[PDB]
């Protein structure tokens, strides 16, 4: 989170937190209620987000669900969608944490190795994450939409 990052940064320098770091934490905690409301909103619409995201992904990448595809069949498509569920929950974690740390450790570090070992194509992952961005930012107001779009962009960049 913002707090853990600031504390670790200060600790590697053996100092108390600076006025800048404390200003960062004040801005983080004063934004906490809005962040929790946005996280609730994205949690409420999780199933819809995953459903239209999978719809768009398979519409724009029909080879994935076609024979020979990585997500071909019912159970493989279910695993495909379960990955989008994982990543949406990671996005909600990152929103309450105030940065992309939880996303990075739970879902970004080692992901290239894991989707290589799984034959999951990464451009497909990027398209799926962008589809989730569109669906999820469709559900929020002006400031929240950009704020959540930043986390989705972080995922898309880290998968590419």
């Amino acid at each position: 989170s913002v707090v853990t990052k600031a504390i670790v940064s200060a600790d590697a320098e053996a100092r108390y937190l600076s006025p800048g770091e404390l200003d960062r934490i004040r801005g983080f905690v004063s934004s906490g209620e809005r962040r929790l409301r946005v996280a609730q909103t994205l949690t409420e619409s999780r199933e819809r987000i995953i459903k239209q995201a999978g719809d768009q992904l398979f519409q724009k990448r029909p080879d994935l669900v076609s024979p020979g595809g990585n997500a071909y069949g019912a159970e493989r498509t279910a695993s495909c969608l379960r990955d989008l569920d994982y990543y949406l929950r990671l996005v909600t974690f990152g929103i309450v944490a105030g940065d992309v740390t939880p996303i990075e450790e739970i879902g970004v570090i080692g992901v290239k190795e894991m989707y290589r070992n799984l034959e999951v194509p990464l451009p497909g992952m990027v398209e799926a994450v962008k589809a989730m961005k569109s669906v999820a930012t469709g559900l929020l107001s002006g400031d929240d939409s950009a704020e959540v779009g930043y986390y989705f962009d972080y995922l898309a960049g880290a998968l590419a």
């Binding site: 950009a146 779009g149 930043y150 962009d153 898309a156 960049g157 590419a160």
Partner: protein, 158 residues
């Protein structure tokens, strides 16, 4: 590195005086343009990989000789290093766009870059063409907000 506010602070400190009315006006101008600059930077960052992909394609359609055997961009290694350098330019231009100042481009990118490119045998006019193609792509996406930083890269390389 310097942003605009620190550049103003440095001038006032060199003169040894407190901030005056015009200095606060310049600071307020930076604070006014900051939001648009942040939006442009976020747009670039969200599409960094796409920007890099069409910028590389535009440069190598413009100069197919580089990809040919005997060219400086001919190998998987040298192609990777070339797109790596272009990614440097894009990311540091975005940094300069947020900071409102070109300093970070100076001490992080252009400092010693020409000497490096002569030592390596990198064709500098082609690198400038790549920077110009990147400028065109970024301007098509976010507008003319980042033009001065790409021009600064191109002129510091020339």
């Amino acid at each position: 590195m310097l942003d605009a506010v620190t550049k103003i602070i440095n001038r006032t400190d060199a003169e040894g005086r407190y901030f005056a009315s015009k200095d606060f006006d310049e600071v307020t101008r930076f604070f006014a343009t900051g939001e648009a600059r942040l939006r442009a930077a976020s747009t670039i960052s969200a599409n960094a990989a796409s920007i890099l992909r069409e910028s590389a394609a535009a440069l190598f359609t413009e100069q197919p000789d580089l990809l040919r055997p005997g060219g400086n961009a001919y190998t998987s290694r040298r192609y990777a290093a070339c797109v790596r350098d272009m990614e440097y330019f894009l990311r540091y231009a975005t940094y300069a766009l947020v900071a409102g100042d070109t300093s970070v481009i100076d001490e992080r990118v252009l400092n010693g870059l020409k000497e490096t490119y002569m030592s390596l045998g990198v064709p500098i006019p082609s690198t400038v063409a790549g920077v110009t193609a990147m400028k065109g792509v970024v301007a098509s996406m976010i507008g003319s907000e980042a033009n001065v930083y790409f021009d600064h890269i191109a002129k510091g390389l020339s």
